[PDB]
Design a protein around this motif. Structure first.
Motif, PDB file in Angstrom:
ATOM      1  N   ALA A 118       0.843  -1.179   0.000  1.00 12.77           N
ATOM      2  CA  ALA A 118       0.000   0.000   0.000  1.00 12.77           C
ATOM      3  C   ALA A 118       0.885   1.237   0.000  1.00 12.77           C
ATOM      4  CB  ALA A 118      -0.966  -0.060   1.178  1.00 12.77           C
ATOM      5  N   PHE A 119       1.931   1.224   0.823  1.00 19.01           N
ATOM      6  CA  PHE A 119       2.876   2.322   0.908  1.00 19.01           C
ATOM      7  C   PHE A 119       3.618   2.539  -0.421  1.00 19.01           C
ATOM      8  CE2 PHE A 119       7.160   3.507   2.234  1.00 19.01           C
ATOM      9  CZ  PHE A 119       6.923   4.644   3.007  1.00 19.01           C
ATOM     10  N   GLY A 120       3.845   1.450  -1.168  1.00 20.94           N
ATOM     11  CA  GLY A 120       4.576   1.447  -2.430  1.00 20.94           C
ATOM     12  C   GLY A 120       3.790   2.073  -3.570  1.00 20.94           C
ATOM     13  N   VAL A 121       2.489   2.246  -3.353  1.00 21.46           N
ATOM     14  CA  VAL A 121       1.652   2.898  -4.344  1.00 21.46           C
ATOM     15  C   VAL A 121       2.123   4.351  -4.450  1.00 21.46           C
ATOM     16  CG1 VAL A 121      -0.752   3.472  -5.006  1.00 21.46           C
ATOM     17  CG2 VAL A 121      -0.200   1.243  -4.276  1.00 21.46           C
ATOM     18  N   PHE A 122       2.398   4.932  -3.268  1.00 27.04           N
ATOM     19  CA  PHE A 122       2.815   6.300  -3.029  1.00 27.04           C
ATOM     20  C   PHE A 122       4.330   6.480  -3.234  1.00 27.04           C
ATOM     21  CE2 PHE A 122      -1.152   5.397  -0.447  1.00 27.04           C
ATOM     22  CZ  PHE A 122      -1.977   6.458  -0.800  1.00 27.04           C
ATOM     23  N   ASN A 174      12.225   5.042  -1.891  1.00 29.76           N
ATOM     24  CA  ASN A 174      13.151   5.627  -0.923  1.00 29.76           C
ATOM     25  C   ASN A 174      12.747   5.379   0.539  1.00 29.76           C
ATOM     26  OD1 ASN A 174      11.026   7.620  -0.689  1.00 29.76           O
ATOM     27  ND2 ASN A 174      12.410   9.319  -1.196  1.00 29.76           N
ATOM     28  N   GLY A 175      11.573   4.771   0.774  1.00 28.98           N
ATOM     29  CA  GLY A 175      11.029   4.509   2.106  1.00 28.98           C
ATOM     30  C   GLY A 175      10.301   5.718   2.702  1.00 28.98           C
ATOM     31  N   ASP A 186       9.315  15.560   9.882  1.00 29.68           N
ATOM     32  CA  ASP A 186      10.337  15.507   8.829  1.00 29.68           C
ATOM     33  C   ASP A 186       9.910  16.105   7.477  1.00 29.68           C
ATOM     34  OD1 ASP A 186       9.977  12.028   8.432  1.00 29.68           O
ATOM     35  OD2 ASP A 186      10.611  13.157   6.667  1.00 29.68           O
ATOM     36  N   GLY A 187       8.603  16.367   7.280  1.00 30.18           N
ATOM     37  CA  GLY A 187       8.041  16.890   6.035  1.00 30.18           C
ATOM     38  C   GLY A 187       7.725  15.780   5.029  1.00 30.18           C
ATOM     39  N   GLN A 188       7.811  14.520   5.494  1.00 32.43           N
ATOM     40  CA  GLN A 188       7.493  13.320   4.738  1.00 32.43           C
ATOM     41  C   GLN A 188       6.900  12.277   5.684  1.00 32.43           C
ATOM     42  OE1 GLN A 188      10.525  12.562   1.122  1.00 32.43           O
ATOM     43  NE2 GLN A 188      11.599  12.608   3.091  1.00 32.43           N
ATOM     44  N   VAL A 189       6.105  11.350   5.100  1.00 34.61           N
ATOM     45  CA  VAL A 189       5.420  10.226   5.741  1.00 34.61           C
ATOM     46  C   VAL A 189       6.291   8.975   5.567  1.00 34.61           C
ATOM     47  CG1 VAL A 189       3.282   8.825   5.996  1.00 34.61           C
ATOM     48  CG2 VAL A 189       3.059  11.156   5.251  1.00 34.61           C
ATOM     49  N   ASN A 190       6.572   8.291   6.691  1.00 29.70           N
ATOM     50  CA  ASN A 190       7.323   7.046   6.659  1.00 29.70           C
ATOM     51  C   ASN A 190       6.324   5.921   6.934  1.00 29.70           C
ATOM     52  OD1 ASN A 190       8.897   5.600   9.348  1.00 29.70           O
ATOM     53  ND2 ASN A 190       7.618   7.404   9.711  1.00 29.70           N
ATOM     54  N   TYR A 191       6.817   4.661   6.934  1.00 29.90           N
ATOM     55  CA  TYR A 191       6.040   3.443   7.077  1.00 29.90           C
ATOM     56  C   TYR A 191       5.177   3.494   8.332  1.00 29.90           C
ATOM     57  CZ  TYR A 191       4.343  -1.331   7.652  1.00 29.90           C
ATOM     58  OH  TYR A 191       3.547  -2.397   7.924  1.00 29.90           O
ATOM     59  N   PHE A 195       2.574   5.992   8.228  1.00 30.14           N
ATOM     60  CA  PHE A 195       1.606   5.550   7.227  1.00 30.14           C
ATOM     61  C   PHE A 195       0.594   4.576   7.828  1.00 30.14           C
ATOM     62  CE2 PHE A 195       0.274   2.822   3.541  1.00 30.14           C
ATOM     63  CZ  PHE A 195      -0.337   3.782   2.720  1.00 30.14           C
ATOM     64  N   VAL A 196       1.086   3.591   8.610  1.00 29.47           N
ATOM     65  CA  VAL A 196       0.286   2.635   9.376  1.00 29.47           C
ATOM     66  C   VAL A 196      -0.841   3.329  10.172  1.00 29.47           C
ATOM     67  CG1 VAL A 196       0.449   0.828  11.273  1.00 29.47           C
ATOM     68  CG2 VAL A 196       1.927   0.717   9.295  1.00 29.47           C
ATOM     69  N   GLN A 197      -0.529   4.426  10.901  1.00 31.22           N
ATOM     70  CA  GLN A 197      -1.507   5.153  11.709  1.00 31.22           C
ATOM     71  C   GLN A 197      -2.526   5.953  10.896  1.00 31.22           C
ATOM     72  OE1 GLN A 197       0.333   6.638  15.596  1.00 31.22           O
ATOM     73  NE2 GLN A 197      -1.560   5.604  16.233  1.00 31.22           N
ATOM     74  N   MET A 198      -2.082   6.519   9.767  1.00 36.11           N
ATOM     75  CA  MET A 198      -2.862   7.324   8.831  1.00 36.11           C
ATOM     76  C   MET A 198      -3.946   6.482   8.122  1.00 36.11           C
ATOM     77  SD  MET A 198      -1.523   9.607   5.538  1.00 36.11           S
ATOM     78  CE  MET A 198      -0.092   8.568   5.256  1.00 36.11           C
TER      79      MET A 198
END
Ligand SMILES: [Ca+2]
Ligand SMILES: [Ca+2]
Ligand SMILES: [Ca+2]
Ligand SMILES: [Ca+2]
Length: 402
Positions: free
Chosen positions: A344-348, A353-354, A389-394, A397-400
């Motif tokens: 799901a994260f890989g869609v984005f 780059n993670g 950090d100005g970016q969403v990490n794994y 992403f889980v919480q979102m």
């Protein structure tokens, strides 16, 4: 005014669309296939048991049914059973127990294309269940009473642990504790082995693999004794971890009330509309392609057909609004694995780059539908940017996605 009360809105839409494609890409029903050698059927599927302090426990099932009788049986073409389970407790029951409610319906064979035993299932049939268990040397017994109504594919059963404290979680025994009560539609009555085996019945054998833990081995006799349908099971469990999810009782019972908020329906309706580009109330292969294509995937017509067929209750070859609602309700009740969330994260995360750059989130939502501006985009990021950090990490992403 409020960027926030409409970025939270725009988020869900895309979260749901991505989770919906994850679902159509999964195999969540009970897959049935003929077994000419044994004059019977084989089945495979997996069960999701939500872990008490977040996470999901997977249980891989392999099933085998052989008739007890010498007489003719129906050997089905490949199809699936679609199940809704509801587990509850009796407020007046002092003993360790489980109340089970199940609706089971056959599907998987499209419209573009009966038995003597079926006679016994036209009314409400009383059921009796009896199990002797042994898991890592911890013995137990379960007794069950209830009723089946195959006209609606409805099952209702109350179980008591006759030996005291059940040493394993109740959810882990649901599949063990009468597939003859499924509703087969008129177009599919010739694929019903279960009923065809009756009154003599069948032997049901299964191996259930709890990932990262042990397994069960079950043997059951399902037959009529008088006008009662009886299920007598022996279960043997080996290789469990004492501290693990099963022996350590770390699984949820049954959370979420079976029915949806007028609010959750609307949440899902927004998502549904991303696919239902023409506003006809149904999602075609053409429509699903567009969505997938715009998420970077590139599926064949065959794939699209298959995907739809995972949730196509009426076999019309399209996902209608209600079917979509069922699918999303179920996807909401049962937790996704690490790998699933990764996908799901890989869609984005297009560069891999993670990290979900504000740039990449804009790209996604563009291709999908929305007319989001670099202001709303920013607002989303901020909402679940735990580490500023100005970016969403794994982890973020889980919480979102809850
Ligand atoms: Ca449509
Ligand atoms: Ca349909
Ligand atoms: Ca990235
Ligand atoms: Ca961050």
């Amino acid at each position: 005014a409020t960027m926030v009360d409409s970025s939270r809105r725009k988020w869900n839409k895309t979260g749901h669309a991505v989770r919906a494609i994850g679902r159509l890409s999964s195999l969540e029903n009970v897959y049935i296939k003929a077994d000419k050698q044994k004059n019977g059927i084989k089945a495979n599927y997996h069960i999701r048991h939500n872990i008490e302090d977040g996470g999901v426990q997977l249980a891989y099932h392999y099933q085998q049914n052989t008739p007890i009788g010498d007489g003719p049986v129906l050997l089905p073409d490949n199809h699936y059973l679609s199940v809704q389970s509801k587990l509850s407790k009796d407020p007046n029951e002092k003993r360790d127990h489980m109340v089970l409610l199940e609706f089971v319906t056959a599907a998987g064979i499209t419209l573009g294309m009966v038995s003597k035993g079926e006679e016994l299932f036209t009314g409400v049939v009383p059921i009796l269940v009896e199990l002797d268990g042994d898991v890592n040397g911890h013995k137990f017994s379960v007794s069950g009473e209830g009723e089946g109504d195959a006209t609606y594919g409805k099952l209702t059963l109350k179980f008591i642990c006759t030996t005291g404290k059940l040493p394993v979680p109740w959810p882990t025994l649901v599949t063990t504790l009468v597939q003859c009560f499924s509703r087969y539609p008129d177009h599919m009555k010739q694929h019903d082995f279960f009923k065809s085996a009756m009154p003599e019945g069948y032997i049901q054998e299964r191996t259930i693999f709890f990932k990262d833990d042990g397994n069960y081995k079950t043997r059951a006799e399902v037959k009529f004794e008088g006008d009662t349908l009886v299920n007598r099971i022996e279960l043997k469990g080996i290789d469990f971890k004492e501290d693990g999810n099963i022996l350590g009782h770390k699984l949820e019972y049954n959370m979420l009330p079976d029915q949806l908020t007028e609010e959750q329906i609307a949440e899902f309706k927004e998502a549904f509309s991303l696919f239902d580009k023409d506003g006809d109330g149904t999602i075609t292969t053409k429509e699903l392609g567009t969505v997938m294509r715009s998420l970077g995937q590139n599926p064949t017509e065959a794939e699209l057909q298959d995907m739809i067929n995972e949730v196509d209750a009426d076999g019309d070859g399209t996902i209608d609004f209600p079917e979509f609602l069922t699918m999303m309700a179920r996807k909401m009740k049962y937790r996704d694995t690490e790998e699933e969330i990764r996908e799901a994260f890989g869609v984005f995360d297009k560069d891999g780059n993670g990290y979900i750059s504000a740039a990449e989130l804009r790209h996604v939502m563009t291709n999908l539908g929305e007319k989001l501006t670099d202001e709303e985009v920013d607002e989303m990021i901020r909402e679940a940017d735990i580490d500023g950090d100005g970016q969403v990490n794994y982890e973020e992403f889980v919480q979102m996605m809850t």
